Design a protein around this ligand. Structure first.
Ligand SMILES: COc1ccccc1C(N)=O
Ligand SMILES: [Mg+2]
Ligand SMILES: [Zn+2]
Ligand SMILES: [Zn+2]
Ligand SMILES: [Zn+2]
Ligand SMILES: [Zn+2]
Lengths: 131, 285
């Protein structure tokens, strides 16, 4: 009974991160040790005529980005572990995340390492025009 | 190819909305096209779901610099025979709002200890994963009729894991700087370990130079077996699956070839005693 959600390629990385005290550090260390990035993400078929904002209610990928469903880009959602904010809720789940195409091979790692500018809504270092 | 790890055990007929689905596989079929997914304005998110996620199928075979391996070789286990603690879990089946996974019910150790837990599970919601009590029923067998009263004699997991850390500390403080769980068909025991084990790099105790065997969520601190009072997590444990050593039949039949003093009372601690006993006989004779 039941319906699978995962593929064998993710078993090792998700098992390792699901048991860690610091899951974020465990994933970064996993990637640094040559481990393959988490796959099976929700990549969207979109027009690529979007605003380019990082986290949105609809896919907003531009020509230099890829749109993904937010829960599939969140390490905590993928591992079914506690979210690190005090309220215990997710900031990606329920939204769409725009990842630069050059980083689309690892959308979970991209959202773990990067921050969104709270003024322009673009990723810091990848679209945020202001200083 | 798919795995049973994180299998959705809910009875909801539809898949998830692209923004709520953890994976492409779990996205509802309505949204799938050309190997990708599409957003369909007008089809809303589900804001009230409670989906039980299966913790059966963990694979602890990672190779990460600075992180020790959980599963050790037979020769490394022999060197640490003082750290051996047999471990077995009898479980119950998820029921009513979910079906397809087992939940820890009786946790037995080679120390004679049996700890009963409230049937608890990992439930995906629109905001997070809620670690909470779930409906459950004992396995339908007559050899599992002793589990029916246990469905109401369980303790919440925050209490259960404190007892495990306490029992392991009392038993191992003057014997070892580690714990080696001796298992037989480790799958479900490894699932149970998700409820009381934390892993990471090798750390030292906060009150001494001994390596850390415990972790505290309340203080974000690490401790050895001597200074673990109030600690809730077993930190960096080791383990081995005796069943994988070429044995043909079940645990009891292989145990009974070398030993006649550990009868089967059918409880989790008896299987844990038999597992450690078999490991000692096979390894040192
Ligand atoms: C400390 O080892 C023990 C001592 C007495 C009874 C059982 C055990 C054990 N670990 O299985
Ligand atoms: Mg058993
Ligand atoms: Zn999340
Ligand atoms: Zn900005
Ligand atoms: Zn200490
Ligand atoms: Zn015996």
């Amino acid at each position: 009974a039941g319906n699978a959600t995962e593929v064998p390629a993710n078993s090792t990385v998700l098992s390792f991160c699901a048991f860690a005290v610091d899951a974020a550090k465990a994933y970064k260390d996993y990637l640094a040790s040559g481990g393959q990035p988490i796959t099976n993400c929700v990549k969207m078929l979109c027009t690529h005529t979007g605003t380019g904002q990082a986290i949105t209610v609809t896919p907003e990928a531009n020509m230099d980005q890829e749109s993904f469903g937010g829960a599939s880009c969140c390490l905590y959602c993928r591992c079914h572990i506690d979210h690190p904010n005090p309220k215990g809720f997710c900031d990606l789940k329920g939204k769409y995340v725009q990842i630069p195409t050059t980083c689309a091979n690892d959308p979970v790692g991209f959202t773990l390492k990067n921050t969104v500018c709270t003024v322009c809504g673009m990723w810091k270092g990848y679209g945020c025009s202001c200083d | 190819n798919v795995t049973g790890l994180f299998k959705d055990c809910s009875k909801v007929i539809t898949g998830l909305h692209p923004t709520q689905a953890p994976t492409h596989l779990s996205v509802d079929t309505k949204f799938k096209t050309e190997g990708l997914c599409v957003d369909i304005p007008g089809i809303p998110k589900d804001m009230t779901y409670r989906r039980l996620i299966s913790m059966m199928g963990f694979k602890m075979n990672y190779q990460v610099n600075g992180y020790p391996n959980m599963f050790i070789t037979r020769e490394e286990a022999i060197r640490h025979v003082r750290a051996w603690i047999g471990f077995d879990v009898e479980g119950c089946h998820a029921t009513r709002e979910a079906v397809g996974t087992n939940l820890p019910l009786q946790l037995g150790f080679s120390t004679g200890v049996n700890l009963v837990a409230v049937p608890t599970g990992y439930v995906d919601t629109p905001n997070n994963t809620d670690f909470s009590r779930v409906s459950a029923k004992p396995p339908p067998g007559d050899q599992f009729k002793h589990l029916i009263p246990l469905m109401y004699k369980g303790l919440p997991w925050n209490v259960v894991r404190i007892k495990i850390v306490q029992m392991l500390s009392d038993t191992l403080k003057n014997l070892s700087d580690r714990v080696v769980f001796v298992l037989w068909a480790h799958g479900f025991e490894l699932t149970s370990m998700k409820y009381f084990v934390k892993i990471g790099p090798e750390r030292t105790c906060c009150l001494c130079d001994r390596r850390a065997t415990c972790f505290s969520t309340a203080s974000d601190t690490y401790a050895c077996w001597h200074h673990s009072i109030g600690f809730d997590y077993v930190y960096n444990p080791f383990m081995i699956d005796v069943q994988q050593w070429g044995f043909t039949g079940n645990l009891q039949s292989n145990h009974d070839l070398y030993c006649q003093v550990h009868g089967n009372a059918h409880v989790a601690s008896c299987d844990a005693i038999m597992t450690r006993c078999l490991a000692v006989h096979e390894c040192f004779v």
